[PDB]
């Protein structure tokens, strides 16, 4: 039989996944980045203005 | 504009009362307790991840000589053996802080108890703002301190600074007395290079990804906004190519990136300790934190074969009656004045001087401690 | 109370109008729902906003006009979906034509 080996035949399955690409859907969510410092400022200001 | 600080004796005419108009202003103290509670949680999540309570006030480091074999002969005898040894020490400082409040009898005759509870709460906030400042200042202020314990003067250190005993030799890494973990980018904007250089400052002592050390990068939003844009093999700022992709964590918005149909390996976990992780770059878990000043990167290692702890040791006084924030009776106790004091004593030092590093993003010149955390600058953030 | 500075509506005007609420923190970040009330003369221009296409006065739209489920259909122009979210067909009791 074929005795050929490589770091691939000795390896592990790559544990790969698909990541969201925005193709082949009707709409795409707006990419709204919100860091925690901005969440703190909103929540502090809301609680002050109440 | 700045907040005000009224600091006199409380007289009549500093009283707050139900207005002619019938508004009970004394009900409206603690209007901002909830916004203070938000920033108090923010300070706590840093303190419990940057610090540990000191139970052992002094740390050793030891150096010893060696010996060698020789080839044997059939009539003659080999040379003898000995070992020289030396040792060095470091510790943590301890400092004292206090506040007074004072009232005239005319204030006390008419005052609503809600107004003195309001001042008491403002003092508790100021105590937290003090402890937090001194924890950040222990890490950011790169100057060596001295402390007296049991009539001996010890060194009290920050991270490696080009001062004190050098780092140990590790696997052909050898270090000068000038070796430092306070550094500059040499450029006005953050590179991919900078995160790669900052990691080598931890890795050069061991403390590495293959040693199992987990890592955290704390950064201001202004740096994370650039780091978010790093793509593997693409040029970013100052002509740096990125060695890695920025990988977002599970909390981030879904983004239509070019040349990115699949992810090899996991996303970084959404939180590190209590802090929210935005994503990762190489082995760094990246946290946005506005208590890090703009233009500073703070890299910290945890765990691994060397078992890195939290970077700053927090030292308290030996007597349990002197631990925590304390209320003390006044010198004025009768008439016409009453007074009283608040006090706390605590201090700080670094035990594992290589387990973190700080970079300041600037073109040229020495590292500056940021004025918000420099030791001379005050007692609040 | 403000003016567009142009005789015909831009996509930039919906951005400038959104800014007047967001400057106070009333914002998509804060989870604020937003309603735009407009006349036919304006909505008939706003229906034509498409991402990256120039509108009136050299304004370029940063989002797509997404029609509501009650509106007439459209062919999707690209393999990429429209940049936006399709609204519910009503806001309170009002009839929603779409989102931007």
Cα angle B359, B48, B343; round to 5 = 105
How far does A5 lie from chain C, in Å, by closest CA? 42
Question: For chain B, what's the residue count?
Answer: 381
| CA distance linking residue B210 with residue B254, whole number of Å | 31
Which one of A28, A34, A42 has the shortest CB-CB distance to C80? Answer: A28
Residue C18 Rama label (left phi>0; alpha psi -120 to 50; beta): alpha
| Interface contact flag, B288 A33, Cβ < 8 Å | no
Cβ-based neighbours of B142, under 8 Å, separated by 6 or more:
B158, B159, B161, B180, B182, B358, B367, B369
Which chain A residue is nearest to residue B35, measuring alpha carbons? A44
Q: Which of B362, B374, B354, B363 is nearest to B168 (CA)?
A: B354
Using an 8 Å Cβ cutoff, are B324 and B269 in contact? Answer: no
DSSP-derived letter for residue B225 is H
| Technique used | cryo-EM
B-chain residues within 8 Å CB-CB of A32? 253
Angstrom CA distances, B129 to B64, B319, B328, B340, B378, stand at 44, 24, 20, 21, 11
First to last CA, chain B: 16
Tokens of B10: 């409380």
Task: Write out chain C residues lying below 8 Å of A40, CB-based.
Answer: none
Q: Decide: B158 and B142 in contact? Cβ < 8 Å.
A: yes
Please report the DSSP string for B186-216 in residue order.
SSSS--HHHHHHHHHHHHTTS--TTTTEEEE
Contact criterion met (CB < 8 Å) for A37 and B221: yes
- Cβ pair B17, B112 in contact under 8 A: yes
Phi then psi dihedrals of residue A17, to 5 deg: -145, 170
B254, B257, B271, B274: best mutation site toward chain A, by most A Cβ within 10 Å?
Answer: B254
Q: Strands of chain B (E only): list them.
A: 51-53, 58-64, 85-91, 95-104, 145-149, 152-156, 182-184, 213-219, 246-248, 262-264, 271-272, 275-281, 284-288, 296-303, 312-316, 326-333, 337-350, 356-360
CA distance A20 to chain B (A): 7
CA distance C57 to chain A (A): 25
Angstrom distance (rounded) from CA C8 to CA C56:
7
- Which residues have a Cβ under 8 Å from the Cβ of B322 and sit 6 or more positions away? B316, B345
Q: What is the 3-state secondary structure (H, E, C) of chain C?
A: CCCCCCCCCCHHHHHHHHHHHHCCCCCCCCCCCCCCCCCHHHHHHHCCCCCCCECHHHCECCCCCEECCCCCCCCCCCCECEEECCCCCEECCEECCEEC
Q: Is B117 helix (H, G, I), strand (E, B) or coil?
A: helix
- Separation in Å, CA of A12 to nearest CA in chain B: 12
- CA distances C60 to B104, C12, C49, C64, Å, are 67, 8, 9, 11
Give the N- to C-terminal CA distance of chain C in Å, as an integer: 21
Resolution (Å units): 2.4
Torsion, Cα B366 B221 B307 B46, to 10 degrees, reads 100
**Eight-class DSSP state of B241:** B
The Cα–Cα gap between B353 and B345 comes to 24
Smallest Cβ distance to A14: which of B34, B254, B264? B264
Pick A25's closest partner by Cβ from C29, C66, C81: C81
Chain A hits for C66, Cβ within 8 Å? 27
Q: Does the beta-carbon distance from C82 to A27 stay under 8 Å?
A: yes
Q: Are B280 and B209 in contact (CB under 8 A)?
A: no
Residue B169 carries which DSSP code? P
User: Which uninterrupted H or E stretch holds A16?
Assistant: strand A16-18
* Nearest C-alpha neighbor of B208 from the set B309, B298, B310, B283: B283
B151: left (phi over 0), alpha (psi -120 to 50) or beta: left
Which residues of chain A have a CB within 8 Å of the CB of B45? none
* β-pair partners for B326: B343
Q: Which among B300, B361, B1, B333 is positioned nearest to B135, based on CA atoms?
A: B300
State the chains in contact with B (3 or more Cβ–Cβ pairs under 8 Å): A
The residues facing B361 across adjacent strands are none
CB–CB of B38 and A28 under 8 A? no
Whether B284 contacts B303, CB under 8 Å = no
């Amino acid at each position: 039989a074929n005795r050929t080996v490589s770091p691939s035949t000795q390896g592990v399955r790559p544990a790969m996944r698909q990541m969201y690409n925005g193709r082949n859907v009707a709409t795409r969510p707006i990419p709204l980045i919100v860091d925690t410092s901005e969440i703190r400022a909103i929540m502090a200001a809301a609680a002050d203005a109440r | 504009t700045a907040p005000v600080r009224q600091e006199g004796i409380m007289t009549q005419g500093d009283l707050v009362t139900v207005t002619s108009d019938g508004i009970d202003l004394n009900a409206l103290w603690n209007s901002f307790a909830e916004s203070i509670a938000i920033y108090n949680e923010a300070m706590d999540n840093l303190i419990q991840l940057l610090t540990y309570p000191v139970t052992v006030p002094v740390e050793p480091v030891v150096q010893i000589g060696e010996t060698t074999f020789e080839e044997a002969t059939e009539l003659g005898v080999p040379r003898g053996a000995g070992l020289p040894i030396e040792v060095f020490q470091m510790g943590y400082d301890l400092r004292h802080y206090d506040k007074r409040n004072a009232y005239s009898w005319m204030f006390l005759a008419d005052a609503d108890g809600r107004q003195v509870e309001a001042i008491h709460d403002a003092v508790l906030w100021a105590d937290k703002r003090l402890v937090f400042r001194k924890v950040m200042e222990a890490l950011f202020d790169n100057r060596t301190r001295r402390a007296n314990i049991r009539n001996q003067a010890y060194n009290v250190y920050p991270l490696y600074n080009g001062d004190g005993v050098p780092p140990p030799r590790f696997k052909n890494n050898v270090f000068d007395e000038t070796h430092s973990h306070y550094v500059i980018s040499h450029n006005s904007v953050v590179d991919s290079s900078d995160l790669e250089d900052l990691m080598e400052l931890l890795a050069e002592h061991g403390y590495s990804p293959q040693a199992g050390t987990q890592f955290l990068l704390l950064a201001n939003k202004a740096e994370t906004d650039a780091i978010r844009q790093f793509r593997r093999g693409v040029v970013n700022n100052n002509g740096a190519t990125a060695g890695y992709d920025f990988i977002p964590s599970p909390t981030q918005p879904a983004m239509m990136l070019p040349n990115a149909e699949g992810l090899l390996g996991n996303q970084p976990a959404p939180t590190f300790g209590g802090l929210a992780v935005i994503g990762s770059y190489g082995f760094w878990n990246i946290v946005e934190e506005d208590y890090i000043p703009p233009g500073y990167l703070v890299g910290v290692g945890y765990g691994g074969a060397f078992n890195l702890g939290n970077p700053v040791g927090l030292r308290q006084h030996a007597n349990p009656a002197m631990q925590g924030l304390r209320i003390i009776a006044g010198n004025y106790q009768r008439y016409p004045l009453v007074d009283g004091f608040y006090a706390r004593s605590f201090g700080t030092g670094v035990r594992q001087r290589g387990g973190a590093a700080i970079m300041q993003i600037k073109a040229s010149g020495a590292y500056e401690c940021p004025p918000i955390y420099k030791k001379g600058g005050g007692f609040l953030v």
